[PDB]
Amino acid sequence: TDRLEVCREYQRGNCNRGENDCRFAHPADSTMIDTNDNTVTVCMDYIKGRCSREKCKYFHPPAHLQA
RNA sequence: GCUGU
RNA sequence: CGC
RNA sequence: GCUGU
Ligand SMILES: [Zn+2]
Ligand SMILES: [Zn+2]
Incomplete structure (x- = not known):
C-alpha cells in the first residue's frame, strides 16, 4: 500500500x-x-497519523485514496 | 524514511 | 484519465 | 451501470 498512481x-x-x-x-x-509507472511514494507514518515532519518527502494521501 | 500484525 |  | 479527458 506504499505507492499511488498520479493523476495525469x-x-x-x-x-x-x-x-x-x-x-x-x-x-x-x-x-x-517515479516516471516509469507515474507513481508517488506514500508516507506510511501519515497513514497511521504519525507524521510530524515539517517538510515530508512523501505523499500524504487524502482519506478517499486510502483503505 | 518511515511499511511487519 | 487510450487502452 | 454507466462517470476518466
Ligand atoms: Zn485528479
Ligand atoms: Zn509524511
Whole structure:
C-alpha cells in the first residue's frame, strides 16, 4: 500500500473532478514521481497519523485514496 | 524514511 | 484519465 | 451501470 498512481490531468493542469473527487494522487511538486509507472511514494507514518515532519518527502494521501 | 500484525 |  | 479527458 506504499505507492499511488498520479493523476495525469492534474499533471497537465487539467483535473475537473478536483482532488477530493479524484481517484488518483495530486501530490506536491517537491514529491518525486517515479516516471516509469507515474507513481508517488506514500508516507506510511501519515497513514497511521504519525507524521510530524515539517517538510515530508512523501505523499500524504487524502482519506478517499486510502483503505 | 518511515511499511511487519 | 487510450487502452 | 454507466462517470476518466
Ligand atoms: Zn485528479
Ligand atoms: Zn509524511
